[PDB]
Amino acid sequence: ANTTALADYAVRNVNNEIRRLPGVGKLQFFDSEAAMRVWIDPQKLVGYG
Amino acid sequence: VFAELPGRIEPVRVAEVRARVAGIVLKRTFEEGADVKAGDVLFQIDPAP
């Protein structure tokens, strides 16, 4: 299971609603956030100068 | 122990066909991309002088 898709759903749909609720002064999402990852291969960089 | 080293493929024999005599290229005999045999006529430069 890709925990990142689950976390993105939670941030986009769930966390904002709860932090919007009356009485709650702070929502601490205890995980990461989505991000385009660029996994470079230095060997390919070597091949292409 | 095996090492992966960066390398490029080079042909065993390369022949840069260069014109040795000055002139106008009258006719190109070969078609590009084909396989050629030794002595196959490729170009025809005008033998005026």
Give resolution, Å, one decimal: 3.0
A42 at the B interface (CB within 8 A)?
no
The DSSP letter of residue A31 is S
A20-47: b (≥16 Cβ within 10 Å) or e: eeeeeeeeeeeeeeeeeeeeeeeeeeee
Two structure tokens written together for B44: 């025809």
Residue A3 vs residues A9, A11, A19, A33: alpha-carbon distances, Å: 10, 12, 21, 10
State the Cα torsion B3-B9-B13-B19 to the nearest 10°.
Answer: -140
Under a CB-based contact definition with an 8 Å cutoff, are residues A11 and A29 in contact? Answer: yes
Cα–Cα distance, A45 to B6 (Å, whole number): 10
Query: Is A47 within 8 Å of B4 when comparing Cβ atoms?
Result: no
Cα–Cα distance, A5 to A34 (Å, whole number): 8
How many residue pairs from chains A and B have C-beta atoms closer than 8 A? 4
Residue A34 vs residues A5, A16, A17: alpha-carbon distances, Å: 8, 16, 19
Q: Write out residues 6-45 of B within 8 Å (CB-CB) of A.
A: 6
- The beta strand positions in chain A, using DSSP E, are none
